[PDB]
Design a protein around this motif. Structure first.
Motif, PDB file in Angstrom:
ATOM      1  N   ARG A 135       0.840  -1.221   0.000  1.00 37.80           N
ATOM      2  CA  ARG A 135       0.000   0.000   0.000  1.00 37.80           C
ATOM      3  C   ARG A 135       0.868   1.261   0.000  1.00 37.80           C
ATOM      4  NH1 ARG A 135      -4.837  -2.355   3.888  1.00 37.80           N
ATOM      5  NH2 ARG A 135      -6.093  -3.254   2.207  1.00 37.80           N
ATOM      6  N   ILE A 136       1.941   1.272  -0.781  1.00 40.98           N
ATOM      7  CA  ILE A 136       2.844   2.455  -0.909  1.00 40.98           C
ATOM      8  C   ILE A 136       2.332   3.397  -1.993  1.00 40.98           C
ATOM      9  CG2 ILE A 136       5.180   3.128  -1.658  1.00 40.98           C
ATOM     10  CD1 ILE A 136       5.107   2.209   1.285  1.00 40.98           C
ATOM     11  N   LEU A 137       2.287   4.675  -1.636  1.00 39.07           N
ATOM     12  CA  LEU A 137       2.044   5.815  -2.557  1.00 39.07           C
ATOM     13  C   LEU A 137       3.407   6.389  -2.959  1.00 39.07           C
ATOM     14  CD1 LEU A 137      -0.761   7.467  -0.397  1.00 39.07           C
ATOM     15  CD2 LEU A 137      -1.137   6.395  -2.638  1.00 39.07           C
ATOM     16  N   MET A 138       3.555   6.806  -4.220  1.00 35.80           N
ATOM     17  CA  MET A 138       4.848   7.373  -4.706  1.00 35.80           C
ATOM     18  C   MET A 138       4.635   8.757  -5.318  1.00 35.80           C
ATOM     19  SD  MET A 138       6.723   8.167  -7.697  1.00 35.80           S
ATOM     20  CE  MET A 138       6.034   7.074  -8.944  1.00 35.80           C
ATOM     21  N   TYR A 139       5.550   9.674  -5.035  1.00 39.88           N
ATOM     22  CA  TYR A 139       5.568  11.041  -5.620  1.00 39.88           C
ATOM     23  C   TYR A 139       7.001  11.411  -5.986  1.00 39.88           C
ATOM     24  CZ  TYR A 139       5.292  11.256  -0.457  1.00 39.88           C
ATOM     25  OH  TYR A 139       5.386  10.947   0.870  1.00 39.88           O
ATOM     26  N   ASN A 140       7.143  12.269  -6.996  1.00 41.68           N
ATOM     27  CA  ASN A 140       8.454  12.512  -7.653  1.00 41.68           C
ATOM     28  C   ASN A 140       9.052  13.763  -7.032  1.00 41.68           C
ATOM     29  OD1 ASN A 140       9.022  10.452  -9.854  1.00 41.68           O
ATOM     30  ND2 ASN A 140       7.081  11.182 -10.668  1.00 41.68           N
ATOM     31  N   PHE A 141       9.380  13.735  -5.739  1.00 45.15           N
ATOM     32  CA  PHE A 141      10.119  14.825  -5.044  1.00 45.15           C
ATOM     33  C   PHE A 141      11.271  14.230  -4.258  1.00 45.15           C
ATOM     34  CE2 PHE A 141      11.085  18.128  -1.927  1.00 45.15           C
ATOM     35  CZ  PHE A 141      10.904  19.295  -2.643  1.00 45.15           C
ATOM     36  N   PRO A 142      12.478  14.865  -4.282  1.00 48.20           N
ATOM     37  CA  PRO A 142      13.643  14.378  -3.545  1.00 48.20           C
ATOM     38  C   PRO A 142      13.501  14.668  -2.049  1.00 48.20           C
ATOM     39  CG  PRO A 142      14.177  16.477  -4.539  1.00 48.20           C
ATOM     40  CD  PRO A 142      12.797  16.085  -5.044  1.00 48.20           C
ATOM     41  N   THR A 143      12.695  13.852  -1.370  1.00 50.74           N
ATOM     42  CA  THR A 143      12.431  13.962   0.088  1.00 50.74           C
ATOM     43  C   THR A 143      13.697  13.543   0.859  1.00 50.74           C
ATOM     44  OG1 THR A 143      11.379  11.820  -0.036  1.00 50.74           O
ATOM     45  CG2 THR A 143       9.929  13.777  -0.170  1.00 50.74           C
ATOM     46  N   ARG A 144      13.847  14.023   2.095  1.00 51.51           N
ATOM     47  CA  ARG A 144      15.077  13.850   2.912  1.00 51.51           C
ATOM     48  C   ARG A 144      14.714  13.357   4.302  1.00 51.51           C
ATOM     49  NH1 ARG A 144      17.331  19.270   1.990  1.00 51.51           N
ATOM     50  NH2 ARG A 144      17.141  19.722  -0.240  1.00 51.51           N
ATOM     51  N   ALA A 145      15.704  12.738   4.951  1.00 51.75           N
ATOM     52  CA  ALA A 145      15.789  12.502   6.407  1.00 51.75           C
ATOM     53  C   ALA A 145      15.223  13.724   7.143  1.00 51.75           C
ATOM     54  CB  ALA A 145      17.230  12.240   6.786  1.00 51.75           C
ATOM     55  N   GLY A 146      14.254  13.494   8.031  1.00 52.09           N
ATOM     56  CA  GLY A 146      13.559  14.559   8.781  1.00 52.09           C
ATOM     57  C   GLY A 146      12.075  14.641   8.430  1.00 52.09           C
ATOM     58  N   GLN A 147      11.671  14.081   7.288  1.00 55.38           N
ATOM     59  CA  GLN A 147      10.290  14.262   6.759  1.00 55.38           C
ATOM     60  C   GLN A 147       9.398  13.064   7.096  1.00 55.38           C
ATOM     61  OE1 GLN A 147      12.371  17.129   3.830  1.00 55.38           O
ATOM     62  NE2 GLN A 147      11.223  15.507   2.761  1.00 55.38           N
ATOM     63  N   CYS A 148       9.955  12.021   7.718  1.00 55.59           N
ATOM     64  CA  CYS A 148       9.195  10.781   8.015  1.00 55.59           C
ATOM     65  C   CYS A 148       8.085  11.121   8.998  1.00 55.59           C
ATOM     66  CB  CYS A 148      10.063   9.630   8.491  1.00 55.59           C
ATOM     67  SG  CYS A 148      10.947   8.917   7.085  1.00 55.59           S
ATOM     68  N   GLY A 149       6.874  10.648   8.675  1.00 51.99           N
ATOM     69  CA  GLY A 149       5.665  10.913   9.462  1.00 51.99           C
ATOM     70  C   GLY A 149       4.933  12.102   8.870  1.00 51.99           C
ATOM     71  N   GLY A 150       5.569  12.800   7.917  1.00 55.36           N
ATOM     72  CA  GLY A 150       4.949  13.978   7.262  1.00 55.36           C
ATOM     73  C   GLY A 150       3.576  13.597   6.726  1.00 55.36           C
ATOM     74  N   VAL A 151       2.630  14.517   6.688  1.00 56.03           N
ATOM     75  CA  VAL A 151       1.237  14.173   6.282  1.00 56.03           C
ATOM     76  C   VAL A 151       1.092  14.441   4.793  1.00 56.03           C
ATOM     77  CG1 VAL A 151      -1.224  14.530   6.761  1.00 56.03           C
ATOM     78  CG2 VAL A 151       0.545  14.828   8.561  1.00 56.03           C
ATOM     79  N   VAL A 152       0.549  13.473   4.056  1.00 62.45           N
ATOM     80  CA  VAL A 152       0.190  13.664   2.614  1.00 62.45           C
ATOM     81  C   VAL A 152      -1.321  13.938   2.474  1.00 62.45           C
ATOM     82  CG1 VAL A 152       0.448  12.815   0.231  1.00 62.45           C
ATOM     83  CG2 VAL A 152       2.152  12.163   1.948  1.00 62.45           C
ATOM     84  N   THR A 153      -1.678  15.100   1.904  1.00 62.77           N
ATOM     85  CA  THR A 153      -3.079  15.524   1.703  1.00 62.77           C
ATOM     86  C   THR A 153      -3.339  15.938   0.248  1.00 62.77           C
ATOM     87  OG1 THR A 153      -2.670  17.834   2.233  1.00 62.77           O
ATOM     88  CG2 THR A 153      -3.340  16.380   4.080  1.00 62.77           C
ATOM     89  N   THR A 154      -4.591  15.816  -0.167  1.00 63.67           N
ATOM     90  CA  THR A 154      -5.166  16.615  -1.267  1.00 63.67           C
ATOM     91  C   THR A 154      -6.241  17.494  -0.645  1.00 63.67           C
ATOM     92  OG1 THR A 154      -6.892  15.067  -1.728  1.00 63.67           O
ATOM     93  CG2 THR A 154      -4.794  14.760  -2.923  1.00 63.67           C
ATOM     94  N   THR A 155      -6.790  18.416  -1.423  1.00 63.39           N
ATOM     95  CA  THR A 155      -7.998  19.166  -1.001  1.00 63.39           C
ATOM     96  C   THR A 155      -9.052  18.131  -0.591  1.00 63.39           C
ATOM     97  OG1 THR A 155      -8.957  19.316  -3.154  1.00 63.39           O
ATOM     98  CG2 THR A 155      -7.365  21.048  -2.603  1.00 63.39           C
TER      99      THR A 155
END
Length: 182
Positions: A135-155
């Protein structure tokens, strides 16, 4: 800047705390009552720090799908004196792809961070740090150490939490309504 960021900001201001374990500082999404989510690799124990306050963990469950494959989501019930705004009606009911998502982070390292990550793919299977994950979602941004747990939203939807990246792409674990039925 626009209606995507408006929704993301509304979730961050009322539904996030800073969680610290022995593995580091994480953005933690509050979902309802005293129930929150964090990446499983945070290794939640019997005690956790919530906005730098020592907090007893009443329960923690590392979710796996019915094939017994890791989902990389841990549901935590906190011994806190205050409830989260109930946001379960913003959770999707089914696995899906999305357009125009935002990844929002709030830690000591990265306060009030919002990244327009764009198109989100229902990626499915990922070998995440050596662990087979579904159940992995993928997006094309160079994310880094520190962002884990970050929330993914749409409107109007809270769709996942950031769990990893490979330097070019970032990866989120899906949030589904069925995880939080009481």
């Amino acid at each position: 800047m626009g209606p995507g960021f408006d929704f993301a900001q509304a979730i961050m201001k009322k539904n996030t705390v800073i969680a610290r374990t022995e593995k580091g500082e994480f953005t933690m999404l509050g979902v309802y009552d005293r129930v929150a989510v964090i990446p499983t690799h945070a290794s939640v124990g019997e005690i956790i720090y919530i906005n730098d306050v020592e907090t007893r963990v009443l329960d923690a469950c590392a979710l796996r799908d019915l094939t017994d494959t890791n989902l990389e989501i841990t549901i935590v019930k906190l011994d806190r004196n205050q409830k989260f705004r109930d946001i379960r009606h913003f959770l999707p009911r089914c696995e899906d792809d999305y357009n125009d998502a935002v990844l929002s982070v709030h830690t000591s390292k990265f306060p009030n961070m919002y990244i327009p990550v764009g198109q989100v793919t229902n990626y499915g299977f990922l070998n995440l740090g050596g662990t087979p994950t579904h159940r992995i979602l993928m997006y094309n941004f160079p994310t880094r150490a520190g962002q884990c747990g970050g929330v993914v939203t749409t409107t109007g939807k809270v769709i996942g939490i950031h769990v990893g990246g490979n330097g070019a792409q970032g990866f989120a674990a899906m949030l589904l309504h069925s995880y939080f039925t009481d």
